[PDB]
Design a protein around this ligand. Structure first.
Ligand SMILES: Nc1ncnc2c1ncn2[C@@H]1O[C@H](COP(=O)(O)OP(=O)(O)OP(=O)(O)O)[C@@H](O)[C@H]1O
Ligand SMILES: Nc1ncnc2c1ncn2[C@@H]1O[C@H](COP(=O)(O)OP(=O)(O)OP(=O)(O)O)[C@@H](O)[C@H]1O
Ligand SMILES: Nc1ncnc2c1ncn2[C@@H]1O[C@H](COP(=O)(O)OP(=O)(O)OP(=O)(O)O)[C@@H](O)[C@H]1O
Ligand SMILES: Nc1ncnc2c1ncn2[C@@H]1O[C@H](COP(=O)(O)OP(=O)(O)OP(=O)(O)O)[C@@H](O)[C@H]1O
Ligand SMILES: Nc1ncnc2c1ncn2[C@@H]1O[C@H](COP(=O)(O)OP(=O)(O)O)[C@@H](O)[C@H]1O
Lengths: 520, 521, 125
């Protein structure tokens, strides 16, 4: 990476050079005396968009190798019986034909294979013949000494065992997310062109931009720069169409300047970063304090967050919130997850799986947990543990496969020294206990309802929407009667009651409240 | 001109503004501005949309507008030839002028505009893929070009090959949306300017009335309607059709009467989609009669809840349930409430259209309906006979789980952004729904009562219209001093059945049938 | 070597006699299976109250056996599998122990493999 200039995988490339390229830098006479052979392939897996192609391009260029070739995943698979092995054989055919002309002078024809998962046969849950031909061409009755295979993937656990035996693809490597220095380096390579012509502004602080970004991948920063320049062009056009003063201010306005900040929070939506639209959808009207239970729940959540942050013996921590229906459990869980300031946070709600079968839901949950396993910190929030299972009181009836997928994923530990936090939300804890799911968790929390008349009056006053005389009359009417109302139901009832003529407003609200239940 | 209406087309103005912003903005600035830092010159445009929505005219008018050479237009897959290599030679022949201009005039080269009619035909086995690769190499190969513009038009956007959709080859994609009411007004105005010029049109035709009546029409459909009305008007002159032809030339005086247009549109053209009719007269038939107080209360409650969902802020989702005993007239009331709502998007999902579909098909259809409702700004959807939507049988009991789960999840999914919604459901087995734990999802419920008192029965019978004072008095002699329990639909069926006897036995048969149907809860 | 390190985390604590008794029984079983000739196949079942450390003891015994072939068949590697896939995987894992002079296969969490659930009951036949 000294010659490449691009930074981010210097240690990885040094290690890979040691692993394989050590044989390419040595007295050739001792190399001949070696009597050994060279490798036949390698593998590279990691998060998407981490520049797994630039690595191959630069490494191939470094050793003065022939032109590379790129093959995508869904480039071979076809429904026809005999139209899959054709491309696999064709790719090796060109190397085979030229082997005769040189024989011993043949140079390495470095190539790139992308998304090996497409042809791999490991879908136990793509045919089972393409990989046989691939392995045979890689090695068979005849051995080819002028080939090399470089692969790419994001699901390393789905590759077949036969494709990693010592005869072929006997090495592996991983590509990880960069840190602040990596983001600084990336921002120094996708923006130097603007600096060359003095388009950038001195006010743009690269360190501030790097600090603001948390888990941006390689493509995210380039996209942010592109959007920032687009916004600068839009501002320039707005100024031009607004008023004409100089006719040379266009060049000065072409400067990106401080639009990077706006582009950060408006033009880029990282997949591994925090999401604001989920908060907007779930915590809609905002948290309004009306009692001590909210404070108790928040304190417990903060304590659990601290415990998971500062633990070494227990990398896995799981909590569970429960309460009566319409008590507002989702919002509190969303708030707790948000206020953790973790890098990775996702919500696996069931509203995104309308009409799916059991297998699709299992795959979705597995994918979400696999993504969570990557970052150095994670906080997954399972929304409804009673709608994923498809539970109906009649019967009873439910799905066993999802139950198992959940029961096994609440005890697995991350790899090496990574962390994780699993939050849950339910309303029928009794059936969960009946199903033996109540012991897999580590702690339980409660969320009570508005139960006291004074609490209801205080909550209504905080919400306002009623005048002094009306509120006093309401307080007079409630007296010592029983109160068992829900927050969501409370808001809905208030809104419905406030929809008629001003003369009859308290009357209808009181009638609806009384008609409702008054006991657990 | 930038009016976008000086041409012979209209309806899509915002898209015209967007294409003007994104296409010709760079060219307007002098070359000094471009040379300062350069720009991504665009040489790719694709157009699509509902079939026959005026896509072809946009390309022609855009080509005529720009001050450049005449664009080349190819009518579909005319490139293919019997021999080998002819297709590649033909496709190469198109770019010769561009290469010559790039070589000679360099940067200061006149723009080249290329029209591809039915690009989907050629781009989507050896010949076809070779031609596709040749096009891909020519458009973006070793030597770049910046004096070419290629525009393709299709009606199947999902068939265009992925390799051709990458940036740098097809950068601007346009969808031709349905014309609005103002677009329809403009279409009608420009489709009859000739007659007004010669003032041969009858004053009985109100263009605004046609615009209001017409809904979900393409421009070609409007033109066909106009021509069908023209033919209907012309028929009035010709007289002989079975014998040798003879025409009433002397009559002349050609006029376009409203009756001709109405008759033509009645049985000549019908829109492919957007036909929300034939159900507002099918589900609600025989009208709504005021046989007692309850109907007024139900209608008032429906109107109040509709108003609530109209102008609320923190309640973007409202649901109602109309329960009651069978044959009580539930579907008719729901249809009437929906009609009186008067919303942009309305649709009724009923099982009559899913006779034989399995669980997955029902789930997919419901999801499609609800997504369509999601799209528009605000809408009200209704569902009828839930117990039939999820096949239910008392024995066992037996039912389906996929449909129940899909329905349960879809009554609490907030609509995108600030849009609104309204859901109304119907059923007659409230107990089962409550036991399934679905009644807690619905927000409020209403009751639809039966005909209980004899006075109500007499009022309904008089309002419907039948029997007479003497027969009515005889009926009241026995029915007034008692209690009754019957539904309106059953009452209509019984009246119709008993009306088929002899004059002196109708009343006795009706009373016997009423005694047969007598019961109570 | 990674399996033993992963399944055993905080080592073994000698907090009583039962640990020694269990380890002695395991050693006796290992000796019997290595020496005898009329009983080439042996089996043993470990059970107890939940959260008592059974898998750890099984792994420790297996590592102390000093056999040439050792393997562990856990369920967490089979998330989302169907019944046929599980049967094929288990058969493959077992069929690799017939091609060596000695073997020791550990099957753990049987109740999870069979897909048990108190309601019903339900499981894979
Ligand atoms: N102090 C509060 N605690 C909880 N929720 C509150 C509070 N103040 C306001 N809310 C509102 O409560 C709503 C959260 O309830 P939510 O819609 O998530 O119900 P829920 O508990 O998931 O119920 P169910 O799953 O039965 O529908 C949010 O709209 C939030 O605005
Ligand atoms: N939205 C519209 N506004 C105005 N006129 C329209 C519209 N849609 C269609 N038309 C009319 O349609 C007629 C021709 O339509 P169109 O351009 O689709 O024809 P075409 O070339 O046969 O189409 P296609 O390529 O889809 O087969 C023109 O008279 C045009 O006035
Ligand atoms: N005020 C009214 N309300 C309802 N129906 C009325 C009224 N006046 C007359 N009718 C007649 O009663 C009919 C009721 O039939 P409808 O199919 O709507 O009942 P329904 O309860 O849906 O039947 P089912 O539930 O068994 O399908 C109306 O279609 C109409 O013919
Ligand atoms: N003497 C011991 N016997 C057993 N486990 C011990 C002993 N000393 C320490 N441990 C700890 O026991 C833990 C292993 O117990 P583990 O939770 O796997 O038990 P289990 O019975 O297999 O559980 P599960 O029922 O959840 O499958 C390891 O962390 C190890 O540190
Ligand atoms: N470590 C890195 N340093 C500089 N640029 C990077 C890096 N990783 C990714 N990029 C940028 O991301 C863009 C696309 O990366 P790509 O090769 O698609 O990643 P992947 O191999 O994961 O698909 C490239 O143009 C490259 O400039």
């Amino acid at each position: 990476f000294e010659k490449m200039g691009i930074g981010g995988l210097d240690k990885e490339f040094s290690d890979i050079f040691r692993r394989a390229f050590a044989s390419r830098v040595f007295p050739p006479e001792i190399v001949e005396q070696m009597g050994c052979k060279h490798v036949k392939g390698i593998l590279l897996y990691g998060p998407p968009g981490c520049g797994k192609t630039l690595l191959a391009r630069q490494i191939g260029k470094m050793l003065n190798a022939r032109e590379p070739k790129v093959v995508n995943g869904p480039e071979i698979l076809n429904k026809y019986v005999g139209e899959s092995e054709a491309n696999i054989r064709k790719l090796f055919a060109d190397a085979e034909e030229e082997q005769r002309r040189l024989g011993a002078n043949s140079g390495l024809h470095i190539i790139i294979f992308d998304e090996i998962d497409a042809i791999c046969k490991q879908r136990g849950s793509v045919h089972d013949t393409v990989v046989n031909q691939l392995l045979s061409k890689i090695d068979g009755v005849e051995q080819l000494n002028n080939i090399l295979v470089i692969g790419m993937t994001n699901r390393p656990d789905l590759i077949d065992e036969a494709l990693l035996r010592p005869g072929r693809l006997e090495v592996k490597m991983e590509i990880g997310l960069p840190d602040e220095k990596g983001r600084l380096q990336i921002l120094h390579i996708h923006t130097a062109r603007m600096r060359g012509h003095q388009l950038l502004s001195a006010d743009v602080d690269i360190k501030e931009l790097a600090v603001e970004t948390k888990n941006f991948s390689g493509a995210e920063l380039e996209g942010l720069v592109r959007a920032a320049q687009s916004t600068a062009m839009n501002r320039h056009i707005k100024a031009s169409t607004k008023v004409e003063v100089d006719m040379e201010k266009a060049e000065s306005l072409q400067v990106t300047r401080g639009d990077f900040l706006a582009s950060l929070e408006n033009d880029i939506k990282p997949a591994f970063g925090t999401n604001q639209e989920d908060y907007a959808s779930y915590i809609m009207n905002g948290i309004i304090k009306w009692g001590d239970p909210v404070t108790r729940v928040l304190d417990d959540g903060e304590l659990l967050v601290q415990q998971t942050k500062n633990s070494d013996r227990t990398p896995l921590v799981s909590v569970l919130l429960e309460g009566p229906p319409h008590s507002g459990k989702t919002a509190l869980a969303a708030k707790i997850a948000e206020e953790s300031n973790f890098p990775f946070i996702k919500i696996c709600s069931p509203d995104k799986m309308i009409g799916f079968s059991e297998t699709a839901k299992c795959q979705a949950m597995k994918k979400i947990f696999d993504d969570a396993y990557k970052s150095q910190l994670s906080c997954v929030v399972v929304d409804d543990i009673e709608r994923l299972l498809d539970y109906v009181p009649i019967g009873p009836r439910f799905s066993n496969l999802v139950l198992q997928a959940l029961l096994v994923l609440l005890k697995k530990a991350p790899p090496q020294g990574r962390k994780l936090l699993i939050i849950g939300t339910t309303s029928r804890k009794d059936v969960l206990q009946e199903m033996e799911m109540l012991n897999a968790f580590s702690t339980t929390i409660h969320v009570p309802n508005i139960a006291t008349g004074e609490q209801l009056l205080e909550a209504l006053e905080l919400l306002g929407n009623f005048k002094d005389k009306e509120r006093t009359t309401i307080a007079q009417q409630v007296k010592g009667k029983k109160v068992w109302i829900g927050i969501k139901k409370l808001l809905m009832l208030i809104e419905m009651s406030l929809q008629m003529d001003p003369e009859y407003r308290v009357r209808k609200f009181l009638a609806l409240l009384r008609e409702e239940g008054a006991s657990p």
